[PDB]
């Protein structure tokens, strides 16, 4: 529970950087836009994530359906795994049956 | 070996008759109100009560009935421009003599927004017709 | 700041490469051919005679059709000796 004795450099954030400055800027596309092009669209991220949610087992069941084949073996199969038990754990267990 | 075809626009006005509006119309004004179905609009001018009530997009008194738990049943009247207070005034004053006693009320400033406790829906229609809105 | 050029939607014809290996199956389909012509078809330069069944598909089709569903007459004809039976 020993703590620093030494101050640490100031962080200076300027929020009007590029970044923080154009936050949300096409947010509205599909309303302002006439619609066409729909803001899932403006979603960057994983492939299988995109303008979807789900909770874990979810989360793993779809990646395994869509990226599944370009996986490497390590990480397929750790993916199995992890699919078998959470499949177990949310089925099987829990306090309110 | 690909079958021959013919263009011509004489047949297209019919599929104008297949798309769909994507906006509600405005009801198309008739010699007689109310209409068969019971359907009447608001006045010309706008009484002079300080508060006032927009009709819904399909121009219905905007007056709902709610229930909660299952047993309780409440009635939400909606859209209301002014004092509300004022209108609760009118509504309270109004409900009273049926009931018995005093109704109890919840009073909504931010939302616009009045509860009354009972299922009134159809008495307060009656209502709002009459002063107009 | 100026923002960026807004995201917009290309309304140009579109064909994925036909011999690309890496190409999904659900873009390369005979359907989809129709589907572009149904949006566009003549900046879409999809043949228009394409879009019928083939002579080969029109007599499959004509086959299912005599086969699974008779005639009107053929069906009424087929009420008849229920109801005889019945009386």
């Given amino acids: 529970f020993h703590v620093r004795v030494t101050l640490p450099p100031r962080k200076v954030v300027d929020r009007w950087n590029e970044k923080r400055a154009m936050f949300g800027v096409y947010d509205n596309i599909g309303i302002l836009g006439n619609f066409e092009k729909h803001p899932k669209e403006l979603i960057k991220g994983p492939i299988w994530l995109r303008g979807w949610k789900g909770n874990e087992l979810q989360r793993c069941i779809r990646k395994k359906r869509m990226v599944g084949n370009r996986m490497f073996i390590d990480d397929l199969h750790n993916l199995n795994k992890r699919i078998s038990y959470l499949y177990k754990h949310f089925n099987r267990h829990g306090k309110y049956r | 070996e690909y079958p021959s075809f013919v263009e011509s626009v004489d047949e297209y006005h019919f599929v104008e008759r297949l798309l769909p509006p994507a906006s509600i119309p405005r009801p198309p004004k008739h010699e007689h109100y109310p209409t068969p179905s019971g359907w009447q609009p608001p006045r010309d001018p706008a009484p002079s009560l300080p508060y006032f009530v927009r009709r819904s997009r399909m121009h219905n008194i905007p007056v709902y009935r709610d229930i909660t738990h299952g047993n309780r049943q409440m009635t939400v009247i909606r859209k209301v421009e002014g004092d509300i207070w004022a209108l609760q005034k009118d509504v309270e004053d109004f409900l009273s003599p049926l009931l018995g006693k005093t109704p109890v009320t919840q009073v909504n400033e931010v939302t616009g927004t009045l509860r009354v406790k009972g299922y009134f829906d159809q008495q307060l229609k009656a209502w709002l017709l009459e002063k107009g809105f | ?79 008849r000796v229920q109801q005889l039976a019945e009386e």
């Fill in chain 3, 1 to 79: 700041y100026r923002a960026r050029p807004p995201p917009r939607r290309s309304q140009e014809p579109r064909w994925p490469d036909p011999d690309d290996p890496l190409t999904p199956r659900w873009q390369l389909s005979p359907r989809y051919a129709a589907k572009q012509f149904a949006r566009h078809g003549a900046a879409s330069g999809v043949a228009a005679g394409s879009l019928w069944p083939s002579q080969e598909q029109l007599r499959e089709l004509e086959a299912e059709e005599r086969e699974w569903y008779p005639s009107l007459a053929a069906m009424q004809e087929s009420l």
